[PDB]
Write a protein that binds this ligand. Sequence first.
Ligand SMILES: *C/C=C(C)/C=C/C=C(C)/C=C/C1=C(C)CCCC1(C)C
Ligand SMILES: CCCCCCCC/C=C\CCCCCCCC(=O)O
Ligand SMILES: [Cl-]
Ligand SMILES: [Cl-]
Length: 264
Amino acid sequence: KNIESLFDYSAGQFEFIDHLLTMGVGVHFAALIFFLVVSQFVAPKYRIATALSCIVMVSAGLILNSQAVMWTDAYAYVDGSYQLQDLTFSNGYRYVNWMATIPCLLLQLLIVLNLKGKELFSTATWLILAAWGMIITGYVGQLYEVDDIAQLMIWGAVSTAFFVVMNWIVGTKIFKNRATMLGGTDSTITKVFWLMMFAWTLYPIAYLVPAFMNNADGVVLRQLLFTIADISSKVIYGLMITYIAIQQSAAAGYVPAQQALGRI
Ligand SMILES: *C/C=C(C)/C=C/C=C(C)/C=C/C1=C(C)CCCC1(C)C
Ligand SMILES: CCCCCCCC/C=C\CCCCCCCC(=O)O
Ligand SMILES: [Cl-]
Ligand SMILES: [Cl-]
């Protein structure tokens, strides 16, 4: 049902996708160790924001690892090209993983925005419901990326509606609570919003690849887009969230945070 299954791949195409996925694994688990060691410099009220980055790193790292092994399982070099064997490859499992990772990315944002109690629970709930609507409708849509391009587009339209509403909630919370943030992170959190807008929008572009580039090179392009997007939306994002957590911790008088920023 996926366009990946339609084509044979040259040695170059096959190996590049393998390297993209493998590199993705290394980047996330490398970042995992960074987030782990810096967590001790975060104040208790923000420390879960940094923990969520660890959780996202392993989750994304495992799905990338799984995709890489699925890639090598499904294809073998036969008569001059990599051809599909018995096992299959699908991006569908990425969608399932987003059901967990996207709420995590949203939650660590709400935390450094200094949301608490009732407002935190209610905002998270609406955000997660919007994200799940986006992901599920998108998942259904990509089931038709070979059989029914029209259906892919309509489901994508519905998914985009959830996407836009989700982004509106995020933007509204960011620009409203910006004033509550310490140590100059009121400026930093604004760049985080724009980072999210840019990075998350790469995913629907990858989703539409079967519509404007239905060939083996399009398959390479989609994996390349995912790689750029994953690194930007999880790793660079996580690094900025953690920076914001540490900076606000120091400004609130957390001594290990103050000492940490003092060494650098
Ligand atoms: C770490 C993974 C992330 C941040 C994934 C984000 C995914 C999206 C923003 C996906 C959005 C989609 C649309 C807006 C339309 C097409 C269907 C989706 C699900 C690909
Ligand atoms: C934050 C950005 C992260 C970027 C991660 C991607 C790094 C490698 C990117 C690709 C370089 C271009 C490789 C050339 C493609 C060759 C085409 C092919 O052989 O299939
Ligand atoms: Cl605290
Ligand atoms: Cl993920």
